[PDB]
């Protein structure tokens, strides 16, 4: 009865944890476009 | 005969002391009531 008590809370927890993990994604998608402008970046200002 | 204050607080007192209210709060907690919106 007492983890039937508790299914309630755990499930926000987890759902939070769900939320992060996307923004997670979105930020790996950022820093990877990132670093091919930078790369494309240090190619130009060799060409300068 | 009639009852009169002191019957009806002895009373209360006896026939309240018997029962349990901690059965009927975890059957208010059950999962057929648990979110009640």
Known sequence: DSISYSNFSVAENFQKMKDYYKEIEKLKIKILQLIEAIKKYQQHVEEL | ?37
């Open chain 2, 1 to 37: 005969f009639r009852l009169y204050w002191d019957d009806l607080k002895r009373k209360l007192s006896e026939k309240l002391d018997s029962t349990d209210f901690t059965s009927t709060i975890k059957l208010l907690n059950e999962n057929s009531y648990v979110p009640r919106e």
